[PDB]
Amino acid sequence: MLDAFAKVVAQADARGEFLTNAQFDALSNLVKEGNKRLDAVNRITSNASTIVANAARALFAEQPQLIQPGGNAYTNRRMAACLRDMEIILRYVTYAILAGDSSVLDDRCLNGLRETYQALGTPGSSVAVAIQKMKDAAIAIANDPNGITPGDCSALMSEIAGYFDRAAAAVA
Amino acid sequence: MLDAFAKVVAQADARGEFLTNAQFDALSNLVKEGNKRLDAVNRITSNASTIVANAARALFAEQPQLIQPGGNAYTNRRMAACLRDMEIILRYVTYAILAGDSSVLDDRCLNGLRETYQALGTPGSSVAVAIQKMKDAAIAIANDPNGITPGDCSALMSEIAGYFDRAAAAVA
Amino acid sequence: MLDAFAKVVAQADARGEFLTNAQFDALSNLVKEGNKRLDAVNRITSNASTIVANAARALFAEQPQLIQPGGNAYTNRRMAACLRDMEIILRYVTYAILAGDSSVLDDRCLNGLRETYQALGTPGSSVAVAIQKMKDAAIAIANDPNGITPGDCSALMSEIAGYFDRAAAAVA
Amino acid sequence: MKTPITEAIAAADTQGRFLSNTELQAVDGRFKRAVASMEAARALTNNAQSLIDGAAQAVYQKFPYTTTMQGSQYASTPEGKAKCARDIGYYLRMITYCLVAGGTGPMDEYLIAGLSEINSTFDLSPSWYIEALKYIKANHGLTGQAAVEANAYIDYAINALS
Amino acid sequence: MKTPITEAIAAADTQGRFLSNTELQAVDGRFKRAVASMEAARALTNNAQSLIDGAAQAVYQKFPYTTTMQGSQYASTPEGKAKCARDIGYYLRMITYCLVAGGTGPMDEYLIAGLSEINSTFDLSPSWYIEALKYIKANHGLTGQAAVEANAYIDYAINALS
Amino acid sequence: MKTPITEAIAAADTQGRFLSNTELQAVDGRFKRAVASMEAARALTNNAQSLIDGAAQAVYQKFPYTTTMQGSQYASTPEGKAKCARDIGYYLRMITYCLVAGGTGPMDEYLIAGLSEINSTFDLSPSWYIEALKYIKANHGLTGQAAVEANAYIDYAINALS
Numbered sequence A, B, C: 001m002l003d004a005f006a007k008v009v010a011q012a013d014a015r016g017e018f019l020t021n022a023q024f025d026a027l028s029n030l031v032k033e034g035n036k037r038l039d040a041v042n043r044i045t046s047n048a049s050t051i052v053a054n055a056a057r058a059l060f061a062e063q064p065q066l067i068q069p070g071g072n073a074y075t076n077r078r079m080a081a082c083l084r085d086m087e088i089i090l091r092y093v094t095y096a097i098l099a100g101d102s103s104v105l106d107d108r109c110l111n112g113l114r115e116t117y118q119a120l121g122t123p124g125s126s127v128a129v130a131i132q133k134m135k136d137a138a139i140a141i142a143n144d145p146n147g148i149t150p151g152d153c154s155a156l157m158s159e160i161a162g163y164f165d166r167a168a169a170a171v172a
Numbered sequence D, E, F: 001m002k003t004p005i006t007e008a009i010a011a012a013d014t015q016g017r018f019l020s021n022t023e024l025q026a027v028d029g030r031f032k033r034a035v036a037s038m039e040a041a042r043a044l045t046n047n048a049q050s051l052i053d054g055a056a057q058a059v060y061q062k063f064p065y066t067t068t069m070q071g072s073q074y075a076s077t078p079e080g081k082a083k084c085a086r087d088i089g090y091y092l093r094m095i096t097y098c099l100v101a102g103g104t105g106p107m108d109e110y111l112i113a114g115l116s117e118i119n120s121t122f123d124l125s126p127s128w129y130i131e132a133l134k135y136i137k138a139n140h141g142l143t144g145q146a147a148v149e150a151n152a153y154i155d156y157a158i159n160a161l162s
């Protein structure tokens, strides 16, 4: 896979050029902003269970049809399955948060994800909803001002949102 | 797979409803008519070899082109292969006879069967002929009045025919 | 796979006919011309390394774009890979030289080869160039008059060329 | 789905052989057993409503906090109760399915598989259900085989909640 | 198809290597052996008809019941005989194929593979063929290598019918 | 591509679990180490030309025959020299990549993988490069960690040429 740094090296090698000052400046602000990234992962990761849990409730709350007799989330096997997917997605997102790149999310998680669900009959749109909801939930946690040294997390949250959105856009 | 009973439960669960009196009546006539079903399987199963054998002869008899030099049944490897298919089909049919459902035949036997043969060059129509012939042969045996307690087998034979036909219609 | 002899038997069995005098005459000139075939394989095989090597140089010489930063042969992994393909192709060709048939080349080597490269982005045309070059190179060696009992190799070389061309035509 | 008949086929299909006698004898046992079982299934289905409701209450007695404590996982409200009334229906509906099929298959596939994660996630408590279940066992007025079969699958639903 | 040449390739291809000397020496042995064999093949093909017919009868002598007993698997009738005349043709045609290929490959692929099931299914009897075969071995007027090779493949057809 | 961060993910993804603390602590070590390394990377990139050229010559001194002997694999000509000037560029460019990534990954993927076959095929000699490399190590005017890191990857490029 690729991380923020390996990504830039990739782009340089492809032109057989050394990194430009602007590129060096980018990779050095990432490192500087390091600690903040670590808190995000550690935070999202630590609350994964509740993050998923609540999103599910929200989802079935707006879309009761999924938990009718036969909707796709009907029955514990299928319901269990949906819960697993929300976690699989989440887990990959955190991987992306730490890498500073979405390659790992795109490659191991999002690709062909749209076809898979289609074949199964599973409604992508809804999955996207469940993602859009974990997003708000996860960003509330990561960016919570309590218990953390004050500072600007905007850049990062924006990026974290990028990833989630990227995912919802890959299954809707 | 599904059996006559699991099939009805499937249809109910999908509406999250309990079985209707009419459904209970259906599953109870199946049980009552049980013994007859058992004789059919036991009978068809016990004569599998001769059932297949004769159908083959009949087939090559009406269609000598299949056993020319190169027709598809030419050569012992290919001929052997055809004989195996007639038995595979038959074997699945009996499975269906016992289940009171064709799920096992449709899923493990008939699906993609049409493509398979096409790729190979094997003429579906002919396979269907070989099936249509095992059908008459098998129904003569199952429904033979000798050596069995008198009673109405019509319903069942009709069903047994259903399965065979279902198969020939899945490869022609 | 098929060799020159098994090929003729194949064609006869398919008509359930015995070999015709003309067919027997063909298979007997092959045997007579045997030794020459053996020298070709032994020769091409023994010089495989230099055969491949030189073709590569020639190739990148006419097509410097492949060894730019990112061309497809850029980087030792990719370059190494190209070298391997030239050898894989060559190796199969020699197999064909010895069989008196291209079945082994067509089946284990050339089929789907065009798609494979396409998916990868690898330019078929160029691969064909690298093949066309190993051809001239290999035919110079096989048909070299030094160190070998004088005699007419034309027929054979023509055949050997056939194979190579067959390959370049299967990826261009 | 796992049923006596389908297991038999599954076995035969695994070794690529036609069906044995042993297998056939097995289906017959299932047909024989199917009488008192279809009876249990019919009974319970006809008493569906009273067993559900009678079950609903019994779980608001052994566990009063569920009726008071606020929080979506509690019957403390209407929609809460609606949910629980729905679940016992599902539990009841499942037993009769097993009854009709001659095995735990229905229950295994539709309820058992994934039960833990789902109870653990939505903060649902097994106690509540083993309770509603324990009430069903002593309130189905079944006797002879009909009750034997019925009870068997009920206990299964309990161990599965352990 | 299995031939001395193709086995050699098969070996080399398995280990992903070019062809060895040992392998090359092998093909040469096959070419050397190919002379008297193409000769046996040519001979037998030119005597095709008499060996078939002479073979046909010889099997109606050792096994008379085949000419009388009614039933499609018997030569008791024309179409019956037609079939048997066809089969010895197939058997004969197969030996020459092995001769041309320098191995039992042809015979293995086109006849041997599936031989049992097919004899067992159509109620065909090996005896009949080992018979027709035994007549071919002593009626091909072959000598030296031509006969050596020829006979080798014939016996192979027999053991395969055992 | 193998980097401290990606290895960490690779590990977590293999066992299907979220990221541990141990893993997180690992990335932090990488970020901490990333300072003096980005510095080494920046330095070397700014001295790119002189190190290349200074390296070019140093390999025409230890190995004079390369400047005289005819043959495309030799710098005996312009295009020959062009090629070698290009290769040290590639070698130099690779070290800084490893520096930016915090691992040998870049070098592994882009240069190391396939190095042998390629040196062996084009008749390229490791000596020439371990030489150009040995000159870079003592001509980057780096000190403290910047030099520590830099040198580490250089030696790696050498063992890989052994």
Ligand SMILES: *[C@@H](C)[C@@H]1/C(=C/c2[nH]c(/C=C3N=C(/C=C4\NC(=O)C(CC)=C4C)C(C)=C\3CCC(=O)O)c(CCC(=O)O)c2C)NC(=O)[C@@H]1C
Pocket: A032, A033, A034, A035, A036, A038, A039, A040, A042, A142, A143, A144, A145, A146, A148, A149, A150, A151, A152, A153, F021, F024, F025, F028
């Ligand atoms: C967003 C998160 C917002 C915010 C953050 C903010 N955090 C820090 C500093 C630190 N965070 C850590 C935590 C870790 N470092 C690690 O390597 C690991 C993995 C084992 C963890 C969990 C650390 C060590 C620091 C630095 C020491 C410190 O506490 O200062 C800072 C500051 C500086 C910086 O980036 O380093 C800030 C500004 N505060 C908010 O309200 C945000 C929502």
Ligand SMILES: *[C@@H](C)[C@@H]1/C(=C/c2[nH]c(/C=C3N=C(/C=C4\NC(=O)C(CC)=C4C)C(C)=C\3CCC(=O)O)c(CCC(=O)O)c2C)NC(=O)[C@@H]1C
Pocket: B032, B033, B034, B035, B036, B038, B039, B040, B042, B142, B143, B144, B145, B146, B148, B149, B150, B151, B152, B153, D021, D024, D025, D028
């Ligand atoms: C169709 C088959 C026609 C017909 C049948 C007919 N059969 C029976 C009864 C029985 N058949 C069996 C055989 C088995 N039972 C098994 O469990 C197994 C597997 C081990 C077998 C092979 C048995 C035990 C009976 C019942 C006892 C008896 O012989 O009566 C009946 C009758 C009743 C019923 O359905 O039970 C009938 C009417 N008769 C024909 O001519 C048909 C062609």
Ligand SMILES: *[C@@H](C)[C@@H]1/C(=C/c2[nH]c(/C=C3N=C(/C=C4\NC(=O)C(CC)=C4C)C(C)=C\3CCC(=O)O)c(CCC(=O)O)c2C)NC(=O)[C@@H]1C
Pocket: C032, C033, C034, C035, C036, C038, C039, C040, C042, C142, C143, C144, C145, C146, C148, C149, C150, C151, C152, C153, E021, E024, E025, E028
């Ligand atoms: C094309 C190759 C041209 C040419 C050839 C030519 N070669 C021969 C004869 C022989 N070659 C061999 C070599 C082998 N035989 C083997 O079985 C093996 C594998 C172990 C090898 C490597 C042999 C034994 C002979 C025969 C003995 C001899 O040297 O004469 C001949 C002649 C006859 C024939 O075909 O047998 C010719 C005419 N000469 C050229 O200039 C060609 C380019």
Ligand SMILES: *[C@H](C)[C@H]1/C(=C/c2[nH]c(/C=C3N=C(/C=C4\NC(=O)C(CC)=C4C)C(C)=C\3CCC(=O)O)c(CCC(=O)O)c2C)NC(=O)[C@@H]1C
Pocket: A057, A060, A067, A073, A074, A075, A076, A079, D059, D060, D063, D066, D067, D071, D072, D073, D074, D075, D076, D080, D081, D083, D084, D085, D087, D088, D090, D110, D111, D118, D122, D124, D128, D129, D132
């Ligand atoms: C009743 C005994 C007690 C009670 C129940 C209660 N359950 C839920 C929510 C859910 N229950 C299930 C269970 C199933 N779904 C199935 O499809 C099947 C198989 C047919 C089973 C067994 C599920 C999936 C949910 C959540 C999804 C949903 O809301 O439908 C709740 C609600 C929890 C919430 O947060 O909204 C409640 C209250 N509660 C009690 O106090 C009773 C003692």
Ligand SMILES: *[C@H](C)[C@H]1/C(=C/c2[nH]c(/C=C3N=C(/C=C4\NC(=O)C(CC)=C4C)C(C)=C\3CCC(=O)O)c(CCC(=O)O)c2C)NC(=O)[C@@H]1C
Pocket: A066, A071, A072, A073, A074, A078, A079, A081, A082, A083, A085, A086, A088, A108, A109, A110, A113, A116, A120, A122, A123, A126, A127, A130
């Ligand atoms: C939840 C938000 C919704 C839902 C989900 C649901 N998903 C499946 C089944 C599968 N999901 C995947 C996806 C992945 N597998 C992977 O390994 C990865 C990367 C690590 C991904 C993204 C796959 C492969 C399956 C099928 C295999 C399997 O069943 O395990 C189901 C089950 C469908 C079924 O019939 O079996 C369900 C129900 N369903 C919903 O209703 C929600 C809206």
Ligand SMILES: *[C@H](C)[C@H]1/C(=C/c2[nH]c(/C=C3N=C(/C=C4\NC(=O)C(CC)=C4C)C(C)=C\3CCC(=O)O)c(CCC(=O)O)c2C)NC(=O)[C@@H]1C
Pocket: B057, B060, B067, B073, B074, B075, B076, B079, E059, E060, E063, E066, E067, E071, E072, E073, E074, E075, E076, E080, E081, E083, E084, E085, E087, E088, E090, E110, E111, E118, E122, E124, E128, E129, E132
């Ligand atoms: C002859 C020695 C005796 C004899 C033969 C007889 N054979 C058959 C039928 C079949 N024989 C074969 C055999 C082959 N088919 C092949 O393609 C090959 C490889 C080239 C072989 C060896 C097959 C497949 C059949 C059945 C299909 C068909 O009819 O063609 C019969 C007819 C049996 C019937 O019931 O119709 C007979 C009579 N019978 C004798 O009495 C001779 C002693």
Ligand SMILES: *[C@H](C)[C@H]1/C(=C/c2[nH]c(/C=C3N=C(/C=C4\NC(=O)C(CC)=C4C)C(C)=C\3CCC(=O)O)c(CCC(=O)O)c2C)NC(=O)[C@@H]1C
Pocket: B066, B071, B072, B073, B074, B078, B079, B081, B082, B083, B085, B086, B088, B108, B109, B110, B113, B116, B120, B122, B123, B126, B127, B130
């Ligand atoms: C007989 C009625 C006709 C005939 C048949 C024939 N079939 C094949 C080859 C295959 N058949 C299948 C089918 C199945 N495989 C399965 O596992 C199942 C479910 C249990 C089915 C239905 C497959 C997969 C093959 C190919 C694999 C194989 O060869 O074993 C052949 C062989 C074709 C070949 O060239 O190899 C033949 C001849 N042929 C006829 O002429 C009859 C009309």
Ligand SMILES: *[C@H](C)[C@H]1/C(=C/c2[nH]c(/C=C3N=C(/C=C4\NC(=O)C(CC)=C4C)C(C)=C\3CCC(=O)O)c(CCC(=O)O)c2C)NC(=O)[C@@H]1C
Pocket: C057, C060, C067, C073, C074, C075, C076, C079, F059, F060, F063, F066, F067, F071, F072, F073, F074, F075, F076, F080, F081, F083, F084, F085, F087, F088, F090, F110, F111, F118, F122, F124, F128, F129, F132
């Ligand atoms: C320089 C230290 C000495 C020298 C070098 C020389 N190299 C080549 C040819 C090649 N070098 C490579 C190496 C790489 N290609 C890559 O993409 C990478 C990773 C970025 C590496 C390390 C390759 C692939 C070639 C051949 C392909 C090509 O020509 O580009 C030559 C030319 C050989 C020829 O026959 O044309 C030379 C001369 N020669 C010296 O004398 C120096 C001491």
Ligand SMILES: *[C@H](C)[C@H]1/C(=C/c2[nH]c(/C=C3N=C(/C=C4\NC(=O)C(CC)=C4C)C(C)=C\3CCC(=O)O)c(CCC(=O)O)c2C)NC(=O)[C@@H]1C
Pocket: C066, C071, C072, C073, C074, C078, C079, C081, C082, C083, C085, C086, C088, C108, C109, C110, C113, C116, C120, C122, C123, C126, C127, C130
């Ligand atoms: C060289 C002339 C050109 C070139 C080649 C190149 N090829 C690949 C990758 C693959 N090639 C194959 C082909 C085969 N595999 C086989 O097993 C056989 C039969 C024995 C054949 C014909 C395959 C399967 C691959 C992909 C698998 C793999 O990478 O090993 C590459 C690599 C592409 C990549 O990104 O990984 C390259 C570079 N490239 C050129 O520029 C030349 C013009």
